[PDB]
Write an enzyme that holds these catalytic residues in place. Sequence first.
Site: not given
Ligand code: HEM
Ligand code: HEM
Lengths: 75, 93, 385, 57, 62, 247, 50
Positions: C202, C206, C228-229, C272
């Site tokens: 912010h 962007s 658009k989103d 995975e």
């Molecule tokens: C939970 C994961 C993430 C969320 C919710 C998130 C959210 C956002 C959002 C809402 C934007 C603005 C919309 C857009 O530009 O696409 C943004 C921009 C950006 N995010 Fe992420 N992001 C995440 C993970 C990451 C990761 C893994 C990277 C890379 C290391 C990253 C790098 C960026 C960059 C560089 C921008 C600016 C792009 C631009 O507008 O020029 N973000 N992010």
């Molecule tokens: C950051 C977001 C999250 C990611 C990326 C994530 C990822 C995962 C993945 C990959 C599995 C295994 C799924 C499978 O093969 O069965 C899993 C299982 C699980 N996750 Fe998450 N998780 C997220 C958020 C949460 C949160 C916040 C909770 C707790 C409130 C949660 C509760 C569980 C539980 C209870 C399982 C148990 C196995 C199942 O029923 O899938 N997850 N999660």
Amino acid sequence: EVTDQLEDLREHFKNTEEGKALVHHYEECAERVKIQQQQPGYADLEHKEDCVEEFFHLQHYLDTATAPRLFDKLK
Amino acid sequence: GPPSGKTYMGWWGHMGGPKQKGITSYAVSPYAQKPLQGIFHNAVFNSFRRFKSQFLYVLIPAGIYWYWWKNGNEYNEFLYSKAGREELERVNV
Amino acid sequence: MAFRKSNVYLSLVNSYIIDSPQPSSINYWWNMGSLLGLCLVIQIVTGIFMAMHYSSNIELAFSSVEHIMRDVHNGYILRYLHANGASFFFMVMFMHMAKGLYYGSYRSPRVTLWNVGVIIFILTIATAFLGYCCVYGQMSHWGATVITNLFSAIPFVGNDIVSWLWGGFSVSNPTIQRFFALHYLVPFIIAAMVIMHLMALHIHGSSNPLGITGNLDRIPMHSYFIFKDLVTVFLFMLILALFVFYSPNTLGHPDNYIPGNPLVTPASIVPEWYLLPFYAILRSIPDKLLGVITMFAAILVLLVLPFTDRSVVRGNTFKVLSKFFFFIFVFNFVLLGQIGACHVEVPYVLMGQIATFIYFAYFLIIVPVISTIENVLFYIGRVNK
Amino acid sequence: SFSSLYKTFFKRNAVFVGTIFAGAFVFQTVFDTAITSWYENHNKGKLWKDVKARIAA
Amino acid sequence: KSTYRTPNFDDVLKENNDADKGRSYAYFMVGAMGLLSSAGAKSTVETFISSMTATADVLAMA
Amino acid sequence: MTAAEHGLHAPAYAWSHNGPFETFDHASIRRGYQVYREVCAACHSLDRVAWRTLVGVSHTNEEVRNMAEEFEYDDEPDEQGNPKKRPGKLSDYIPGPYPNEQAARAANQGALPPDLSLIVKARHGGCDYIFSLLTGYPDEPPAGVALPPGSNYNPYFPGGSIAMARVLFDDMVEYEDGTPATTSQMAKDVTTFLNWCAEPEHDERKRLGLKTVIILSSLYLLSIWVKKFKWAGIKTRKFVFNPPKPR
Amino acid sequence: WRTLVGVSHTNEEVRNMAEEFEYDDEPDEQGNPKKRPGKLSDYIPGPYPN
Ligand code: HEM
Ligand code: HEM
Ligand code: HEC
């Protein structure tokens, strides 16, 4: 009197153009391997030829052949 | 509140771009327009323009890595077969 | 002034969603961030509604997940939504990072935004790992065993770190209860880091696909990029609904429906699919310490990016060699994941080693050389002398 | 009578969102019935009602 | 070229520009999207609540 | 690895439930339960399937109550604290044949028979792998295969050497509806039954998938139209530039 | 039993009491139930089965 439908299909595709060639390859391997088993000192060779490859070629042909046609016959 | 650092984006009114004179915008109402105008022309013509300009950068490296992967897969399948066990023990030992 | 402006909380909502000046020329690759926010909301809600029924003992983990699939009303909806939504979370996150890599959104103003995104990538990798281990199938136990036996390579305190992570002497009931507690905890740390990501985005706005300044032609985010989103949000829901209802166990490994047995090795210990490239970067180095150093350096090599990009224009939109080498990098990442899925055999060892060398030579060797060459060619193409 | 159509349904936003929710109620009932009938008719002979009628006859 | 000479929007302007007709056309589409969004939001919220309601394992022991 | 160590990859039979609008043949689930109870239940357990889930899929309520009464389970102890048995109800689970893993390994040459509740989902190939494993027992192993004693040959098992003997032979099960029980017919029935025991939500899941896919496809197309409508006024902008006078 | 070591008895003094009681073992090769003389990891048993 209803005999096994998959065995009937496998006989029908063993008696085809590809299947007779592939059972010829497998029977030739089986002859060579039983001849190798007749030789003395066979238990101390540590590299024994097996015809899993020719059986796998034959069985993969029969699987690709009888896969779509069988479940029509299966009630 | 307290001021933050020098940023490269202002807000509506003081964005931080240069001064503009002479650039004049024209925009008619969407309620007077046709949405979905030109979607069939741009579906087959503009899309082919974009694909023709931008497919060698995506298709030469994809073809390179897919040919490399296919060649490695065929070499592995030859190695762990019966015809290539001598080469298998040679490149494994 | 308006009430969305003068309020305390509605001014935050207004300046981040409603009145937020977005550039006019950003494309549907800028929808990936909003899709990641939607993904994270989906994961948190479905995970809470399954943690209402999940039992994290080592004797009740797999059977409680099987109880969610069988006894909980619409519980297969929640389970398949969680698993396929984590897979789609990583799909959209790889698209988000690759968009930042293509259009140069890591550069000089947005370096802190890039580093906070890298922190979010580390935390999401860790959350996916812990939640995968929470199922306690056959892949969960042996994946946890390998990736927590990695830390026994540290020379001084390796076994201490390992037996502190395990909570015992192998992956057991203490380790599964740690992993459920931390898998619950960590997405709220991710949500805090997402708020900090939004702050750092912010302050400077962007970028656009041209790389030139967006400060001239700008558009409010409400009523233009809200819809658009919304287009890509409904497309994401469509593809996720297909993968949840019709082909729900495609992206998962079929060994996970075996109960977790420590005395039986399932002959291919594979994580995975979104961890397979870093698993191949691990397995390419023939050392236990250097392998985990190389995997962590593979994740943390994104921070060398704003210092090695010697280009004077931002983004590969108008750069032929940067386009070509970016896509060599992307399909190298695909080949590295495909290598990591496979066994440790003869062409695959050298293939994964050469692909790991390409994965590291892109950030350190290819990008400065190619960007310097493009600076010099951009100068001499239009300077007459 | 597009003026009458607009003035009835789309002028007041309250009547607009009320027609949206009324249509959503009618849509939920009718569309769920249509998908249930199409699915059970496509799978004729394979459902438990048909297996039960075969056992009954 | 003057600023009072507005450019050629003629390829994008619809030939008839009745107000009630075009607004009924736009709001019918926005209302259809809100229609199906209401149905989907109801089904989603009822899915999560019905997941929280009970299980078959205790409804057998009812 | 070698092709024998991967196993033979099972071909793609045309199941009655393959396809995005298809359902389990529920009579095939009924016949598959018959072949499970008469053949497979001697060595294999079904520890995740309750009796009550069978109702309305393959049998009736009074039909499942008789089978549940035919088995016996552990009751709450009596007034003197002695252990007590009880004829089962609908709420109980289908009991396995062996009381523990060591009893199973004593009865099956040291190889534990796996619990068939999730084994369609637990193996790569699924119903194709189960069908091909059950029928693909060659009468003779290929020449050169060093086979251990007590291990039969099956090319679909990874490694070739499986410890399940061939248990499906022609007309071993007299079907209730007079279906001609060959070995492949019985294999099709138990594979449909084990796929039902893996995914009993299959029919309702594909139903809700049809509803969800129709609603989300319609919402995606409406959202595309609404995007183009909201964005038309910006999309058809025109900029002109008459350069200003010098000062 | 292991919590009493260093409080009211010693190690070889607690081991004798734990050996005096008998608990359930892992079943033998034939899957029969089997009893085991108790150890320091086991718990003080109650007088009644239920
Ligand atoms: C939970 C994961 C993430 C969320 C919710 C998130 C959210 C956002 C959002 C809402 C934007 C603005 C919309 C857009 O530009 O696409 C943004 C921009 C950006 N995010 Fe992420 N992001 C995440 C993970 C990451 C990761 C893994 C990277 C890379 C290391 C990253 C790098 C960026 C960059 C560089 C921008 C600016 C792009 C631009 O507008 O020029 N973000 N992010
Ligand atoms: C950051 C977001 C999250 C990611 C990326 C994530 C990822 C995962 C993945 C990959 C599995 C295994 C799924 C499978 O093969 O069965 C899993 C299982 C699980 N996750 Fe998450 N998780 C997220 C958020 C949460 C949160 C916040 C909770 C707790 C409130 C949660 C509760 C569980 C539980 C209870 C399982 C148990 C196995 C199942 O029923 O899938 N997850 N999660
Ligand atoms: C008697 C003893 C039986 C009977 C009557 C059946 N099975 Fe099978 N089974 C048995 C053993 C000892 C093993 C272990 C094999 C090994 O690991 O070496 C098995 C294995 C299976 C498997 C697993 C195959 C695999 O792991 O890839 C399946 C799917 C299986 N058995 C199915 C099955 C069905 C469907 C039966 C009857 C209708 C059946 N078995 C009978 C021992 C025995």
